[PDB]
Amino acid sequence: LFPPQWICCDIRYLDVSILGKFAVVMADPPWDIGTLTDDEMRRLNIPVLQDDGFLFLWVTGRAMELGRECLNLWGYERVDEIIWVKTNQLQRIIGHWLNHGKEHCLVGVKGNPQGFNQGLDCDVIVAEVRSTSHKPDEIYGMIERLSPGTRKIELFGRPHNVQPNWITLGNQLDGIHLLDPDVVARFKQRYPDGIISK
Protein backbone atom coordinates (compact mmCIF):
# COMPACT_ATOMS: atom_id res chain seq x y z
CA LEU A 1 0.00 0.00 0.00
CA PHE A 2 1.51 3.17 -1.42
CA PRO A 3 1.34 5.87 1.35
CA PRO A 4 3.91 6.16 4.18
CA GLN A 5 3.83 3.52 6.91
CA TRP A 6 5.83 3.24 10.11
CA ILE A 7 6.29 1.29 13.35
CA CYS A 8 7.64 2.85 16.52
CA CYS A 9 9.72 0.03 17.97
CA ASP A 10 13.04 -1.17 19.34
CA ILE A 11 14.58 -2.58 16.20
CA ARG A 12 16.54 -5.04 18.33
CA TYR A 13 13.28 -6.68 19.41
CA LEU A 14 10.75 -6.28 16.58
CA ASP A 15 9.98 -9.53 14.76
CA VAL A 16 10.69 -8.25 11.25
CA SER A 17 9.54 -11.51 9.68
CA ILE A 18 6.03 -10.00 9.74
CA LEU A 19 7.02 -7.25 7.28
CA GLY A 20 7.51 -9.32 4.13
CA LYS A 21 10.27 -8.88 1.54
CA PHE A 22 11.65 -5.61 0.17
CA ALA A 23 13.38 -4.51 -3.01
CA VAL A 24 15.48 -1.97 -1.06
CA VAL A 25 16.55 -1.76 2.57
CA MET A 26 18.13 1.38 3.95
CA ALA A 27 19.65 1.73 7.41
CA ASP A 28 21.21 4.68 9.24
CA PRO A 29 22.33 2.90 12.42
CA PRO A 30 23.32 4.56 15.72
CA TRP A 31 26.78 3.01 15.58
CA ASP A 32 28.66 2.68 18.88
CA ILE A 33 31.48 5.03 17.94
CA GLY A 34 20.52 5.27 22.14
CA THR A 35 23.24 3.37 20.29
CA LEU A 36 23.57 -0.32 19.48
CA THR A 37 26.64 -2.35 20.35
CA ASP A 38 28.61 -4.00 17.58
CA ASP A 39 27.08 -7.35 18.53
CA GLU A 40 23.52 -5.99 18.51
CA MET A 41 24.23 -4.64 15.02
CA ARG A 42 25.59 -8.01 13.87
CA ARG A 43 22.55 -9.82 15.25
CA LEU A 44 19.91 -7.67 13.49
CA ASN A 45 17.75 -10.04 11.46
CA ILE A 46 18.47 -8.20 8.19
CA PRO A 47 18.68 -11.53 6.25
CA VAL A 48 14.89 -12.10 6.36
CA LEU A 49 14.05 -8.69 4.84
CA GLN A 50 15.09 -9.45 1.23
CA ASP A 51 15.61 -12.24 -1.28
CA ASP A 52 16.92 -10.17 -4.20
CA GLY A 53 17.68 -6.48 -3.89
CA PHE A 54 19.92 -3.73 -2.56
CA LEU A 55 20.82 -2.41 0.87
CA PHE A 56 21.92 1.15 1.62
CA LEU A 57 23.97 1.40 4.82
CA TRP A 58 25.18 4.75 6.14
CA VAL A 59 28.60 4.57 7.83
CA THR A 60 31.14 6.86 9.49
CA GLY A 61 34.40 6.49 11.41
CA ARG A 62 35.13 2.90 12.33
CA ALA A 63 31.71 1.85 11.04
CA MET A 64 33.23 2.15 7.58
CA GLU A 65 34.79 -1.19 8.57
CA LEU A 66 32.16 -2.48 11.00
CA GLY A 67 29.45 -1.70 8.46
CA ARG A 68 31.30 -3.75 5.85
CA GLU A 69 31.46 -6.63 8.33
CA CYS A 70 27.70 -6.38 9.00
CA LEU A 71 26.92 -6.10 5.30
CA ASN A 72 28.84 -9.31 4.57
CA LEU A 73 27.57 -11.15 7.67
CA TRP A 74 24.00 -10.34 6.64
CA GLY A 75 24.68 -11.87 3.21
CA TYR A 76 25.40 -8.85 1.00
CA GLU A 77 28.28 -7.98 -1.33
CA ARG A 78 29.29 -4.31 -1.35
CA VAL A 79 29.01 -3.16 -4.98
CA ASP A 80 28.93 0.69 -4.63
CA GLU A 81 29.57 3.46 -2.21
CA ILE A 82 27.65 6.73 -2.41
CA ILE A 83 29.21 9.81 -0.90
CA TRP A 84 27.16 12.81 0.07
CA VAL A 85 29.20 16.00 -0.27
CA LYS A 86 27.82 18.36 2.37
CA THR A 87 27.16 21.93 1.24
CA ASN A 88 25.55 25.06 2.60
CA GLN A 89 22.82 26.93 0.71
CA LEU A 90 25.51 28.46 -1.55
CA GLN A 91 26.92 25.04 -2.67
CA ARG A 92 30.10 25.49 -0.64
CA ILE A 93 31.50 22.49 1.20
CA ILE A 94 31.04 22.63 4.98
CA GLY A 95 38.72 11.63 11.87
CA HIS A 96 41.36 13.84 13.45
CA TRP A 97 43.76 14.16 10.51
CA LEU A 98 41.46 15.79 7.94
CA ASN A 99 38.28 17.80 8.07
CA HIS A 100 35.33 15.79 6.75
CA GLY A 101 33.40 17.09 3.77
CA LYS A 102 31.25 14.01 3.13
CA GLU A 103 29.13 11.14 4.52
CA HIS A 104 29.42 7.61 3.14
CA CYS A 105 26.61 5.19 2.23
CA LEU A 106 27.58 1.61 1.36
CA VAL A 107 25.52 -0.16 -1.32
CA GLY A 108 25.16 -3.92 -0.90
CA VAL A 109 23.52 -6.46 -3.21
CA LYS A 110 21.84 -9.73 -2.23
CA GLY A 111 20.76 -12.36 -4.72
CA ASN A 112 20.35 -11.30 -8.36
CA PRO A 113 18.04 -8.28 -8.62
CA GLN A 114 16.14 -8.15 -11.91
CA GLY A 115 14.41 -5.14 -13.44
CA PHE A 116 16.27 -2.42 -11.56
CA ASN A 117 17.49 0.68 -13.41
CA GLN A 118 21.17 0.50 -12.59
CA GLY A 119 23.38 3.36 -13.77
CA LEU A 120 20.68 6.03 -13.90
CA ASP A 121 22.23 8.09 -11.16
CA CYS A 122 25.85 8.59 -10.17
CA ASP A 123 27.48 7.86 -6.82
CA VAL A 124 27.96 11.46 -5.60
CA ILE A 125 25.25 13.50 -3.85
CA VAL A 126 25.71 17.25 -3.52
CA ALA A 127 23.11 18.52 -1.07
CA GLU A 128 22.65 20.90 1.83
CA VAL A 129 23.16 19.91 5.46
CA ARG A 130 20.04 20.15 7.59
CA SER A 131 19.59 19.18 11.24
CA THR A 132 22.15 17.02 12.99
CA SER A 133 22.31 13.57 11.43
CA HIS A 134 19.56 14.32 8.90
CA LYS A 135 20.29 12.45 5.66
CA PRO A 136 19.63 14.17 2.30
CA ASP A 137 16.24 13.50 0.72
CA GLU A 138 17.97 13.01 -2.65
CA ILE A 139 18.68 9.39 -1.67
CA TYR A 140 14.96 8.52 -1.85
CA GLY A 141 14.78 9.85 -5.41
CA MET A 142 17.86 7.89 -6.48
CA ILE A 143 16.33 4.81 -4.89
CA GLU A 144 12.92 5.36 -6.50
CA ARG A 145 14.47 5.73 -9.95
CA LEU A 146 16.55 2.61 -9.33
CA SER A 147 13.50 0.57 -8.27
CA PRO A 148 10.24 2.42 -9.06
CA GLY A 149 7.04 1.37 -7.34
CA THR A 150 8.56 -1.43 -5.19
CA ARG A 151 8.31 -1.88 -1.40
CA LYS A 152 11.15 -0.41 0.64
CA ILE A 153 12.04 -0.44 4.32
CA GLU A 154 14.07 2.08 6.32
CA LEU A 155 15.69 1.17 9.66
CA PHE A 156 16.44 3.76 12.38
CA GLY A 157 14.44 6.44 10.60
CA ARG A 158 12.74 9.45 12.18
CA PRO A 159 9.33 11.04 11.44
CA HIS A 160 10.76 13.22 8.66
CA ASN A 161 11.97 10.04 6.93
CA VAL A 162 8.55 8.52 6.19
CA GLN A 163 7.95 8.28 2.43
CA PRO A 164 5.43 6.64 0.08
CA ASN A 165 6.33 3.03 -0.80
CA TRP A 166 8.43 2.92 2.40
CA ILE A 167 7.86 1.35 5.80
CA THR A 168 9.89 3.21 8.42
CA LEU A 169 11.14 1.68 11.68
CA GLY A 170 12.61 3.56 14.62
CA ASN A 171 12.04 4.33 18.31
CA GLN A 172 11.20 8.03 17.84
CA LEU A 173 8.30 7.50 15.45
CA ASP A 174 4.78 8.26 16.64
CA GLY A 175 2.98 5.00 17.17
CA ILE A 176 2.21 2.42 14.49
CA HIS A 177 0.69 3.35 11.10
CA LEU A 178 0.21 0.33 8.82
CA LEU A 179 -1.95 0.21 5.70
CA ASP A 180 -0.70 -2.78 3.72
CA PRO A 181 -3.30 -5.49 4.48
CA ASP A 182 -0.78 -8.34 4.44
CA VAL A 183 1.39 -6.50 6.97
CA VAL A 184 -1.63 -5.54 9.08
CA ALA A 185 -2.83 -9.15 9.19
CA ARG A 186 0.59 -10.56 10.14
CA PHE A 187 1.09 -7.78 12.70
CA LYS A 188 -2.22 -8.41 14.46
CA GLN A 189 -1.45 -12.15 14.55
CA ARG A 190 2.07 -11.68 15.93
CA TYR A 191 1.16 -8.78 18.26
CA PRO A 192 -2.54 -9.26 19.13
CA ASP A 193 -2.32 -6.76 22.02
CA GLY A 194 -0.19 -4.28 20.04
CA ILE A 195 2.92 -4.59 22.23
CA ILE A 196 6.48 -5.45 21.17
CA SER A 197 8.52 -6.78 24.09
CA LYS A 198 11.39 -9.27 23.83
Binding site: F54, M64, E65, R68, E77, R78, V79, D80, E81, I82, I83, V85, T87, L90, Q91, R92, I93, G95, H96, W97, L98, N99, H100, G101, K102, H104, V107, V109, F116, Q118, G119, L120, D121, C122, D123, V124, I125, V126, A127, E138, G141, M142, R145, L146
Partner: protein
Protein backbone atom coordinates in the same frame (compact mmCIF):
# COMPACT_ATOMS: atom_id res chain seq x y z
CA UNK B 1 17.42 21.89 -6.32
CA UNK B 2 17.94 18.14 -6.71
CA UNK B 3 21.29 17.77 -8.47
CA UNK B 4 20.72 14.00 -8.68
CA UNK B 5 17.59 14.57 -10.79
CA UNK B 6 19.53 17.22 -12.72
CA UNK B 7 22.24 14.67 -13.52
CA UNK B 8 19.56 12.27 -14.72
CA UNK B 9 18.04 15.05 -16.85
CA UNK B 10 21.22 16.58 -18.31
CA UNK B 11 24.29 14.38 -17.65
CA UNK B 12 25.99 17.08 -15.54
CA UNK B 13 27.35 15.42 -12.41
CA UNK B 14 26.24 16.94 -9.09
CA UNK B 15 29.88 17.76 -8.23
CA UNK B 16 29.93 20.14 -11.23
CA UNK B 17 27.98 22.61 -9.09
CA UNK B 18 30.17 22.65 -5.99
CA UNK B 19 31.49 26.21 -5.69
CA UNK B 20 35.11 27.19 -4.95
CA UNK B 21 36.32 23.71 -5.90
CA UNK B 22 43.61 32.81 7.51
CA UNK B 23 44.99 31.53 4.22
CA UNK B 24 48.53 31.10 5.54
CA UNK B 25 49.03 27.59 4.10
CA UNK B 26 52.19 28.98 2.50
CA UNK B 27 55.40 29.55 4.51
CA UNK B 28 54.56 26.05 5.72
CA UNK B 29 54.64 25.12 2.03
CA UNK B 30 57.95 27.02 2.03
CA UNK B 31 59.28 25.10 5.05
CA UNK B 32 58.27 21.85 3.33
CA UNK B 33 60.19 22.90 0.23
CA UNK B 34 63.28 23.84 2.25
CA UNK B 35 63.05 20.57 4.17
CA UNK B 36 62.59 18.36 1.05
CA UNK B 37 65.28 15.88 0.14
CA UNK B 38 66.40 15.86 -3.48
CA UNK B 39 64.05 13.83 -5.67
CA UNK B 40 65.20 10.20 -5.94
CA UNK B 41 63.88 7.53 -8.20
CA UNK B 42 64.47 3.96 -9.21
CA UNK B 43 63.26 1.88 -12.11
CA UNK B 44 62.32 -1.42 -10.59
CA UNK B 45 59.91 -4.11 -11.53
CA UNK B 46 58.13 -4.28 -8.17
CA UNK B 47 56.78 -7.86 -8.68
CA UNK B 48 60.31 -9.32 -9.23
CA UNK B 49 62.03 -6.77 -6.99
CA UNK B 50 62.92 -7.57 -3.40
CA UNK B 51 61.27 -4.58 -1.73
CA UNK B 52 63.62 -4.98 1.26
CA UNK B 53 66.38 -3.36 -0.85
CA UNK B 54 64.57 -0.03 -0.33
CA UNK B 55 65.99 1.40 2.90
CA UNK B 56 65.68 3.01 5.32
CA UNK B 57 62.14 2.27 6.52
CA UNK B 58 59.69 4.91 5.38
CA UNK B 59 57.59 7.45 7.25
CA UNK B 60 55.05 7.73 4.41
CA UNK B 61 54.29 5.29 1.59
CA UNK B 62 52.09 6.32 -1.34
CA UNK B 63 50.96 3.19 -3.17
CA UNK B 64 49.43 3.57 -6.65
CA UNK B 65 49.22 0.08 -8.22
CA UNK B 66 47.95 0.17 -11.81
CA UNK B 67 44.45 -1.32 -11.58
CA UNK B 68 42.77 -2.76 -14.68
CA UNK B 69 39.74 -0.57 -13.93
CA UNK B 70 41.90 2.48 -14.74
CA UNK B 71 42.09 1.25 -18.36
CA UNK B 72 38.45 1.35 -19.43
CA UNK B 73 39.07 2.00 -23.13
CA UNK B 74 42.75 1.02 -22.99
CA UNK B 75 51.09 -4.73 -16.87
CA UNK B 76 48.01 -4.33 -14.66
CA UNK B 77 48.09 -5.28 -10.97
CA UNK B 78 45.31 -7.32 -9.39
CA UNK B 79 44.40 -7.11 -5.74
CA UNK B 80 45.89 -10.62 -5.53
CA UNK B 81 49.23 -9.11 -6.62
CA UNK B 82 48.90 -6.07 -4.36
CA UNK B 83 47.93 -8.00 -1.24
CA UNK B 84 51.08 -10.11 -1.59
CA UNK B 85 53.40 -7.08 -1.46
CA UNK B 86 55.39 -7.11 1.77
CA UNK B 87 54.75 -3.46 2.63
CA UNK B 88 55.16 -4.05 6.37
CA UNK B 89 58.82 -4.93 5.69
CA UNK B 90 59.65 -1.37 4.56
CA UNK B 91 57.31 0.67 6.78
CA UNK B 92 58.73 2.38 9.85
CA UNK B 93 57.13 1.27 13.17
CA UNK B 94 55.35 4.62 13.28
CA UNK B 95 54.34 5.45 9.73
CA UNK B 96 51.54 6.18 7.29
CA UNK B 97 50.22 4.78 4.03
CA UNK B 98 48.10 6.29 1.26
CA UNK B 99 46.62 3.60 -0.99
CA UNK B 100 44.74 4.48 -4.19
CA UNK B 101 41.92 1.91 -4.28
CA UNK B 102 39.81 2.92 -7.28
CA UNK B 103 36.03 2.73 -7.12
CA UNK B 104 35.14 -0.97 -7.06
CA UNK B 105 36.39 -4.05 -5.21
CA UNK B 106 39.50 -2.12 -4.09
CA UNK B 107 37.42 -0.27 -1.50
CA UNK B 108 37.17 -3.60 0.33
CA UNK B 109 40.41 -5.33 -0.71
CA UNK B 110 42.40 -2.16 -0.04
CA UNK B 111 41.15 -2.28 3.55
CA UNK B 112 42.22 -5.93 3.83
CA UNK B 113 45.68 -4.86 2.59
CA UNK B 114 45.99 -2.08 5.17
CA UNK B 115 45.16 -4.50 7.97
CA UNK B 116 47.42 -7.16 6.45
CA UNK B 117 50.35 -4.70 6.53
CA UNK B 118 49.57 -3.60 10.09
CA UNK B 119 47.76 -0.30 9.51
CA UNK B 120 44.40 0.98 10.66
CA UNK B 121 42.50 3.29 8.34
CA UNK B 122 42.21 6.79 9.73
CA UNK B 123 40.88 8.70 6.70
CA UNK B 124 39.12 7.99 3.43
CA UNK B 125 40.10 10.64 0.86
CA UNK B 126 37.73 10.89 -2.10
CA UNK B 127 38.79 12.20 -5.49
CA UNK B 128 35.53 13.54 -6.97
CA UNK B 129 35.61 13.90 -10.76
CA UNK B 130 33.58 16.61 -12.47
CA UNK B 131 32.45 16.38 -16.10
CA UNK B 132 31.97 20.09 -16.88
CA UNK B 133 33.58 19.67 -20.31
CA UNK B 134 31.75 16.54 -21.36
CA UNK B 135 28.26 16.32 -19.79
CA UNK B 136 27.20 14.21 -22.76
CA UNK B 137 29.53 11.24 -22.23
CA UNK B 138 27.72 8.29 -20.64
CA UNK B 139 29.74 5.82 -18.58
CA UNK B 140 30.13 2.12 -19.41
CA UNK B 141 29.32 0.58 -16.03
CA UNK B 142 30.91 -2.27 -14.07
CA UNK B 143 28.52 -5.25 -14.30
CA UNK B 144 28.09 -5.12 -10.50
CA UNK B 145 27.71 -1.34 -10.39
CA UNK B 146 24.39 0.12 -9.26
CA UNK B 147 25.40 3.71 -10.04
CA UNK B 148 27.70 5.56 -12.41
CA UNK B 149 31.08 5.73 -10.69
CA UNK B 150 32.43 9.31 -10.66
CA UNK B 151 35.09 9.15 -7.94
CA UNK B 152 38.11 7.22 -6.63
CA UNK B 153 39.23 6.63 -3.05
CA UNK B 154 42.68 7.02 -1.51
CA UNK B 155 42.70 5.33 1.91
CA UNK B 156 44.96 6.74 4.62
CA UNK B 157 46.37 4.24 7.13
CA UNK B 158 48.42 4.69 10.30
CA UNK B 159 50.58 2.27 12.23
CA UNK B 160 52.10 2.75 15.63
CA UNK B 161 51.40 5.59 18.03
CA UNK B 162 51.34 8.19 15.25
CA UNK B 163 43.86 22.51 7.25
CA UNK B 164 42.81 20.03 4.54
CA UNK B 165 39.55 18.21 3.85
CA UNK B 166 39.09 14.62 2.70
CA UNK B 167 37.93 15.64 -0.80
CA UNK B 168 39.82 16.39 -4.01
CA UNK B 169 37.71 17.84 -6.83
CA UNK B 170 39.02 18.02 -10.41
CA UNK B 171 37.71 17.43 -13.91
CA UNK B 172 37.73 13.87 -15.11
CA UNK B 173 40.97 13.33 -17.08
CA UNK B 174 40.97 12.34 -20.74
CA UNK B 175 40.53 8.65 -21.56
CA UNK B 176 43.72 6.66 -21.11
CA UNK B 177 45.08 9.19 -18.59
CA UNK B 178 45.76 7.23 -15.39
CA UNK B 179 47.32 10.06 -13.39
CA UNK B 180 45.99 10.87 -9.93
CA UNK B 181 45.60 14.50 -8.82
CA UNK B 182 48.84 16.05 -7.59
CA UNK B 183 46.74 17.53 -4.77
CA UNK B 184 47.23 14.20 -2.96
CA UNK B 185 50.90 15.13 -2.50
CA UNK B 186 49.90 18.47 -0.96
CA UNK B 187 47.55 16.80 1.53
CA UNK B 188 50.24 14.25 2.44
CA UNK B 189 53.03 16.80 2.83
CA UNK B 190 50.85 19.15 4.91
CA UNK B 191 50.48 16.38 7.53
CA UNK B 192 54.19 16.86 8.45
CA UNK B 193 54.74 13.11 8.94
CA UNK B 194 58.48 12.84 8.34
CA UNK B 195 60.82 13.00 5.42
CA UNK B 196 61.35 9.39 4.26
CA UNK B 197 58.60 9.36 1.63
CA UNK B 198 58.10 6.53 -0.87
CA UNK B 199 55.85 6.54 -3.95
CA UNK B 200 55.40 3.01 -5.29
CA UNK B 201 54.30 2.72 -8.94
CA UNK B 202 55.15 6.36 -9.60
CA UNK B 203 56.31 7.43 -13.07
CA UNK B 204 58.74 9.91 -14.63
CA UNK B 205 55.78 12.32 -14.58
CA UNK B 206 55.26 12.05 -10.79
CA UNK B 207 58.85 12.52 -9.57
CA UNK B 208 58.87 15.20 -6.91
CA UNK B 209 61.35 16.73 -4.43
CA UNK B 210 61.10 15.13 -1.04
CA UNK B 211 60.04 11.78 -2.53
CA UNK B 212 61.68 8.52 -3.52
CA UNK B 213 59.76 7.24 -6.56
CA UNK B 214 59.95 3.55 -7.49
CA UNK B 215 58.19 1.94 -10.43
CA UNK B 216 58.51 -0.23 -13.55
CA UNK B 217 58.10 2.50 -16.18
CA UNK B 218 60.75 4.96 -14.97
CA UNK B 219 63.25 5.68 -17.72
CA UNK B 220 66.12 6.67 -15.39
CA UNK B 221 67.36 5.94 -11.87
CA UNK B 222 69.53 7.81 -9.39
CA UNK B 223 68.74 5.78 -6.27
CA UNK B 224 71.64 4.86 -4.01
CA UNK B 225 70.69 3.42 -0.62
CA UNK B 226 73.66 4.90 1.22
CA UNK B 227 73.16 8.32 -0.37
CA UNK B 228 69.46 8.20 0.46
CA UNK B 229 70.16 7.20 4.07
CA UNK B 230 72.61 10.10 4.36
CA UNK B 231 69.73 12.56 3.98
CA UNK B 232 68.28 11.35 7.30
CA UNK B 233 71.43 10.81 9.37
CA UNK B 234 71.85 12.78 12.59
CA UNK B 235 71.07 15.49 13.41
CA UNK B 236 68.23 15.11 10.87
CA UNK B 237 66.78 11.74 11.93
CA UNK B 238 63.41 12.88 13.31
CA UNK B 239 62.51 16.00 11.31
CA UNK B 240 58.84 16.29 10.37
CA UNK B 241 59.49 17.89 7.00
CA UNK B 242 57.75 21.08 8.15
CA UNK B 243 60.53 22.67 10.23
CA UNK B 244 63.71 24.62 9.59
CA UNK B 245 66.83 22.76 8.53
CA UNK B 246 69.40 22.30 11.30
CA UNK B 247 72.31 24.79 10.98
Amino acid sequence: NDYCQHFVDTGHRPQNFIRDVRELIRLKDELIAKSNTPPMYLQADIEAFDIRELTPKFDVILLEPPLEEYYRETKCWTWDDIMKLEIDEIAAPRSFIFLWCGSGEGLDLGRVCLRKWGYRRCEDICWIKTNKNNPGKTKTLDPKAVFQRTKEHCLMGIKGTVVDIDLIITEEPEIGNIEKPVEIFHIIEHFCLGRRRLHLFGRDSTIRPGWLTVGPTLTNSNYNAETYASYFSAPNSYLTGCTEEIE
